[PDB]
Amino acid sequence: AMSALPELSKKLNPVLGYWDPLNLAELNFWGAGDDATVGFLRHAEIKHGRVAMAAFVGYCVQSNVHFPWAPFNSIPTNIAPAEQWAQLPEAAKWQIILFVGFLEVYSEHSFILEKYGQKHYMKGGKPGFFPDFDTMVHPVPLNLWDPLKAYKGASAERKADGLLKEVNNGRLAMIGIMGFCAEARVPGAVPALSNIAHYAGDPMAPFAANFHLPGFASXXXXXX
């Protein structure tokens, strides 16, 4: 609801609560009521925070080291991590993006999410509900959220505190990852760091150069 967002923001920060200069809590840009917009915005914020904090940890890990499994060193020797991503095989990037899309279409589907006992976030579900992976006859050893258990005995208040902590952590980590990408692309952007370097090509581009693909890889005429 509209009143719940100010309470959640005050729980996240008591000094500054309900900070929306752009408002955005009344723009019904889906035409499905005010609650649907609030649920979409909360889910987008939480997803962006999770992805951004995981990307920050991954950039910190892969900016210095690699994984010794199967010739994963020539790709790690491609300067910046974004150039390493652009230097990965086409099948690798395709399967990674399709894997993430499979997780997204599993989470958003409001019949598997109904098997977990909740609903879609635009229809009253909680913001961020990647559910248990028990829907098909293919026995999975571990699920997505809490893979090696260790969270069954958690309390409701502890869950709410952890949710607020994760929201604030992603709130910081989105700006952190954006600053890392900006310093990678345009030097002198991040004034508190001068160590990260090398170009990223186009940072918002999954396919580049060696990616052949069925046409439409017109990397010519780029922008800033």
Partner 1 sequence: SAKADLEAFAKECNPVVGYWDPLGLADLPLWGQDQDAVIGWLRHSEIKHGRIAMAGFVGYIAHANGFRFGGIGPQNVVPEGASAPEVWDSIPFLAKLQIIGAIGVLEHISEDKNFLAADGMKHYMRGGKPGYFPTFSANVHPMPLNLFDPFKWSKNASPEKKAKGLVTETNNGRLAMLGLFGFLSESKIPGSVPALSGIIPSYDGDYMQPFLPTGPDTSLWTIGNLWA
Ligand X SMILES: CC(=O)O[C@H]1CC(C)(C)C(=C=C/C(C)=C/C=C/C(C)=C/C=C/C=C(C)/C=C/C=C(\C)C(=O)C[C@@]23O[C@]2(C)C[C@@H](O)CC3(C)C)[C@](C)(O)C1
Residue ranges that bind ligand CLA, judged by CB under 6 A: 5, 8-9, 18-20, 24-25, 40-45, 47-48, 51, 97-98, 100-101, 104, 108, 171, 174-175, 178-179, 182, 186, 188-192
Could you tell me how many residues of this chain bind partner 1 (CB under 8 A)? 13
Q: Which residue is nearest to ligand X (CB)?
A: 176
Is 64 a binding residue for partner 1 by CB under 8 A? The answer is no
**Residue 185 contacts by C-beta under 8 Å, 6 or more apart in sequence?**
199, 200, 203
Least Å distance between CB 135 and ligand CLA? 17
Residues in contact with ligand X by the rule CB under 6 A: 53, 56-57, 151, 154, 158, 162, 169, 172-173, 175-176, 179, 190, 192-193
Least Å distance between CB 48 and ligand CLA? 4
- Binding region for partner 1 (CB under 8 A) out of 17-25, 159-167, 176-184, 192-200: 17-25
First-to-last C-alpha distance (Å) of the chain? 39
Least Å distance between CB 69 and ligand CLA? 22
- Taking CB within 5 to 8 Å according to partner kind, which of partner 1, ligand X, ligand CLA, none is near residue 72? none
- Binding region for partner 1 (CB under 8 A) out of 28-36, 58-66, 71-79, 174-182: 28-36
**Residue 4 contacts by C-beta under 8 Å, 6 or more apart in sequence?**
38
Exposure string of 4-27, with b = 16+ CB inside 10 Å and e = fewer, is: ebeebbeebeeeeeeeeeeeeeee
Is 21 a binding residue for partner 1 by CB under 8 A? The answer is yes
Interaction site with partner 1 (CB under 8 A): 21-24, 27-29, 31, 218, 221-224
